[PDB]
Amino acid sequence: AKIIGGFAVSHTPTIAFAHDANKYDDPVWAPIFQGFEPVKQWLAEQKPDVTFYVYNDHMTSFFEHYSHFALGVGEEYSPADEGGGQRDLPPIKGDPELAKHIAECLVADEFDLAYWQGMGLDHGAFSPLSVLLPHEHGWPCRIVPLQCGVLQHPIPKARRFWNFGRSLRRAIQSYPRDIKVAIAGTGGLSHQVHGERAGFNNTEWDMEFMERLANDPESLLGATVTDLAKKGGWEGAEVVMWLLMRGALSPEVKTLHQSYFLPSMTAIATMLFEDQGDAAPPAESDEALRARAKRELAGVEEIEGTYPFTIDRAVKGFRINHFLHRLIEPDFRKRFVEDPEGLFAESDLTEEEKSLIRNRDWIGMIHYGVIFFMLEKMAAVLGIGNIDVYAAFRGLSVPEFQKTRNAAITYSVAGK
Amino acid sequence: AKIIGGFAVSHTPTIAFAHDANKYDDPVWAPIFQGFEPVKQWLAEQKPDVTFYVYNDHMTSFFEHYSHFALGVGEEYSPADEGGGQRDLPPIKGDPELAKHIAECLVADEFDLAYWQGMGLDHGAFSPLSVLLPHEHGWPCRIVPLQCGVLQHPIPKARRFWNFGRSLRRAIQSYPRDIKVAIAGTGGLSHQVHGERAGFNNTEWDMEFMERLANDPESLLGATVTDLAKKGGWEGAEVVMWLLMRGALSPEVKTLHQSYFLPSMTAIATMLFEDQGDAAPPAESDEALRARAKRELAGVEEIEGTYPFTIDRAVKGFRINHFLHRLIEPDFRKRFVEDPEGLFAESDLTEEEKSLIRNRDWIGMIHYGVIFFMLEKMAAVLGIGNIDVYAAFRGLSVPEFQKTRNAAITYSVAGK
Numbered sequence: 001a002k003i004i005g006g007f008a009v010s011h012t013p014t015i016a017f018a019h020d021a022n023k024y025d026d027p028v029w030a031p032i033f034q035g036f037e038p039v040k041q042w043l044a045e046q047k048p049d050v051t052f053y054v055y056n057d058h059m060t061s062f063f064e065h066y067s068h069f070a071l072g073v074g075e076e077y078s079p080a081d082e083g084g085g086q087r088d089l090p091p092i093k094g095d096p097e098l099a100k101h102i103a104e105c106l107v108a109d110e111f112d113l114a115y116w117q118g119m120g121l122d123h124g125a126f127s128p129l130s131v132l133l134p135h136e137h138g139w140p141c142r143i144v145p146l147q148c149g150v151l152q153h154p155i156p157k158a159r160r161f162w163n164f165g166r167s168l169r170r171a172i173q174s175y176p177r178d179i180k181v182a183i184a185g186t187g188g189l190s191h192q193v194h195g196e197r198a199g200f201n202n203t204e205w206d207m208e209f210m211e212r213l214a215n216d217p218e219s220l221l222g223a224t225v226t227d228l229a230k231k232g233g234w235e236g237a238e239v240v241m242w243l244l245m246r247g248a249l250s251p252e253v254k255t256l257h258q259s260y261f262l263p264s265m266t267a268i269a270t271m272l273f274e275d276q277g278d279a280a281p282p283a284e285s286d287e288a289l290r291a292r293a294k295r296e297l298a299g300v301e302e303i304e305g306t307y308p309f310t311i312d313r314a315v316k317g318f319r320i321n322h323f324l325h326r327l328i329e330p331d332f333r334k335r336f337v338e339d340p341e342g343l344f345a346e347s348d349l350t351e352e353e354k355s356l357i358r359n360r361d362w363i364g365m366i367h368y369g370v371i372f373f374m375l376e377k378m379a380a381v382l383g384i385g386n387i388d389v390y391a392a393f394r395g396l397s398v399p400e401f402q403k404t405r406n407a408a409i410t411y412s413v414a415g416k
Numbered sequence: 417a418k419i420i421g422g423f424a425v426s427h428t429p430t431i432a433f434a435h436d437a438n439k440y441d442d443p444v445w446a447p448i449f450q451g452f453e454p455v456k457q458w459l460a461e462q463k464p465d466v467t468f469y470v471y472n473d474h475m476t477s478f479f480e481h482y483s484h485f486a487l488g489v490g491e492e493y494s495p496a497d498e499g500g501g502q503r504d505l506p507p508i509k510g511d512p513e514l515a516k517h518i519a520e521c522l523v524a525d526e527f528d529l530a531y532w533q534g535m536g537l538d539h540g541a542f543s544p545l546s547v548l549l550p551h552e553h554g555w556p557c558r559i560v561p562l563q564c565g566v567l568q569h570p571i572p573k574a575r576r577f578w579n580f581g582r583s584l585r586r587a588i589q590s591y592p593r594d595i596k597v598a599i600a601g602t603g604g605l606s607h608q609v610h611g612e613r614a615g616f617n618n619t620e621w622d623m624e625f626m627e628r629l630a631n632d633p634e635s636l637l638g639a640t641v642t643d644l645a646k647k648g649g650w651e652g653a654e655v656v657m658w659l660l661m662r663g664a665l666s667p668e669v670k671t672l673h674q675s676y677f678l679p680s681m682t683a684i685a686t687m688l689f690e691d692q693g694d695a696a697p698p699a700e701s702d703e704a705l706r707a708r709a710k711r712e713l714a715g716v717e718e719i720e721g722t723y724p725f726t727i728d729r730a731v732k733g734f735r736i737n738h739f740l741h742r743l744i745e746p747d748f749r750k751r752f753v754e755d756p757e758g759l760f761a762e763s764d765l766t767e768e769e770k771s772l773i774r775n776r777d778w779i780g781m782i783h784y785g786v787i788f789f790m791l792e793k794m795a796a797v798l799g800i801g802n803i804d805v806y807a808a809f810r811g812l813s814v815p816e817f818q819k820t821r822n823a824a825i826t827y828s829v830a831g832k
């Protein structure tokens with residue numbers, strides 16, 4: 001509930017490569033590390049509990065289904081395979097509770113989101129994180145990732161990114177735990193990595209953009225994609241993500257540090273901001289925002305025999321849902337019927353999860369966090385219908401349950 | 417550009433099964449068909465070119481990545497496997513042009529979207545379609561699917577669904593072809609299919625809701641999820657999608673038909689609305705709206721050697737981007753390096769597409785519509801770096817290209 005500041009950093013794989021090839025000592029590469037060091041030192045000294053982390057995936061985990069604002073709500077995130085194998089990094093921990101509260105505020109502010117778990121983070125996240133935070137056994141803080149769909153047009157306007165940041169500030173502020181939160185925006189600065197224009201940089205624009213983002217970010221809010229691509233290269237226009245982070249900070253900030261280095265394709269830059277707090281009181285008190293965020297499901301606990309699939313439940317039931325979900329794969333559901341024990345022995349399921357499936361504990365699974373639709377599919381796999389599951393939920397024989405219906409009929413989701 | 421009207425219909429897999437099992441002869445099932453018949457007949461008579469089709473995926477194609485408003489932008493859609501094989505239905509065609517236009521308008525109105533291609537349509541979609549539209553040989557119209565994330569809370573508010581429908585109206589009207597568009601809302605009415613409350617129905621509310629949706633929909637815009645689930649059962653609350661459809665229609669509509677039937681778990685209902693056009697001209701002209709929708713990328717054409725990855729290019733490049741994307745899978749990439757021709761032979765790629773990859777035609781791939789990040793993965797897989805691809809983009813040797821950089825370094829996205 002206290003924002004301590006935030007940082008902006010390039011995410012080019014140059015950075016990841018430098019860490020992985022130990023170019024630390026090499027003077028050609030060294031300005032990257034000198035650039036990142038104060039940010040690294042600040043994070044080690046301030047110890048945020050959670051860093052809300054703004055980046056874009058580069059058509060690695062996000063491709064056939066591609067969303068604008070994708071909130072990472074899961075327990076952990078491993079590195080993604082980008083065609084040369086996963087980087088040797090430990091998973092970083094998420095924060096489902098914080099993520100949930102943020103989702104709730106942002107949805108009440110009429111932003112449309114995506115939620116995701118269990119997919120890798122590509123270079124867009126782990127390239128700079130790997131230089132900013134020591135990563136033995138785990139990582140110094142939690143992150144709540146926000147993956148932004150900045151590469152498939154149309155994308156949200158610069159001002160939408162800004163306005164997201166503003167709502168994010170209040171959401172974070174109003175989270176009812178006394179914890180420290182830093183905000184990161186990655187990407188940029190100028191670069192183009194495609195077409196005959198590949199190799200474009202604009203240091204003059206980079207300096208001005210840095211200056212304006214720090215001290216007059218509202219001046220940037222009428223910039224178009226075209227404006228940003230013309231001045232800083234096609235992919236350099238990813239800096240709208242810097243506007244999101246900056247919008248989540250105080251109207252004025254202390255620039256603790258900034259760095260600029262252009263060795264190759266990309267202007268590698270960092271910026272470190274100390275939040276200055278709110279000069280003005282907020283239009284809406286934390287108390288009132290918290291009540292407005294929960295008003296959609298206020299009173300929902302009064303509904304008996306109902307297990308709302310909220311984010312916490314989605315996270316709790318993730319492994320088992322994910323396993324049951326694979327029953328739509330013909331080779332997987334074949335192994336499930338024929339050699340279930342072989343499939344369990346290979347899974348990441350707890351004994352309790354295996355046992356619920358093995359016992360066909362219909363209500364037990366709903367209770368646990370399984371969404372009915374996973375049970376619907378399992379039913380189909382076993383050649384039994386929906387009515388069988390419903391009767392099990394009611395603790396009744398199929399015949400007794402069928403008496404509650406206006407007609408006695410049967411059906412399933414089975415195809416051909 | 418002309419909206420002819422819209423229809424609301426239940427999407428329970430009772431309907432899909434009723435059709436696949438030929439239950440039209442059984443009087444217990446008969447009235448499912450009796451209810452759908454007028455909507456069937458209206459469709460055959462009116463012949464819309466495209467149905468803009470609002471449904472929810474029941475955690476089949478959307479699970480680990482789950483978005484609020486996911487717009488189907490691809491060429492065609494096949495039925496999904498839901499554990500019992502795909503239903504025996506021919507693919508239905510998309511409308512990438514209409515979908516791109518709608519994206520542009522909705523984003524300008526500050527709705528945050530997801531874009532998807534190539535994933536199957538579950539019972540949310542094909543269940544009622546299979547009874548609404550003959551499919552002996554393909555389908556009578558195209559669709560643009562809007563998959564709504566109504567199952568994992570927090571979801572967007574009732575008023576947000578409605579407002580989406582309000583912009584969608586203008587989005588469709590402003591589309592510059594004289595096609596006829598129908599709009600479909602699916603789901604409902606009262607049902608609950610999980611927990612000890614499974615089997616809840618409330619006919620008295622279903623009737624009020626039908627009444628109010630037809631003739632006073634704005635009186636529904638204050639309903640919370642709690643209101644909807646309490647009155648209509650947990651899953652019954654998906655009727656927010658009916659609201660979205662209704663928002664896209666004229667403020668007043670003529671109800672041509674409604675039906676209601678409660679055999680088993682779900683209240684199976686249909687509503688058919690005739691659009692009445694616009695009483696007064698819109699707040700914003702079609703032309704001003706298109707201006708607003710296009711301004712972010714206006715004058716992007718003046719940026720040389722640059723190929724914005726817009727939706728049309730995402731559709732054009734889908735097959736090949738998909739194929740290259742699979743380079744992230746260890747087994748796939750090993751086949752790619754070791755027997756590319758075997759891999760090509762198995763794939764759905766065209767000869768041109770195969771050539772582009774075979775010849776390592778970097779810039780030719782960009783021109784074709786391959787996004788660079790697929791090429792980045794491909795270079796990594798092949799043991800070469802980003803520099804190599806950038807040099808080819810420019811038509812320079814690597815040493816000649818390195819001279820344009822401040823330092824001559826090499827790097828890639830390779831892991832362990």
Ligand SMILES: O=C(O)c1cc(O)c(O)c(O)c1
Pocket residue numbers: 011012013014058187188191193235264265266792802
């Ligand atoms: O070649 C580069 O410097 C580069 C490559 C990337 O994939 C990227 O996202 C980036 O920001 C920079």
Ligand SMILES: O=C(O)c1cc(O)c(O)c(O)c1
Pocket residue numbers: 376386427428429430474603604607609651681682
């Ligand atoms: O059992 C039912 O009537 C039912 C099952 C579903 O999976 C569903 O999406 C629905 O709207 C109704």
Ligand SMILES: [Fe+2]
Pocket residue numbers: 019088130135
């Ligand atoms: Fe490391």
Ligand SMILES: [Fe+2]
Pocket residue numbers: 011056058124187188238
């Ligand atoms: Fe990026």
Ligand SMILES: [Fe+2]
Pocket residue numbers: 435546551
């Ligand atoms: Fe059929």
Ligand SMILES: [Fe+2]
Pocket residue numbers: 427428474603604651654
């Ligand atoms: Fe449903």
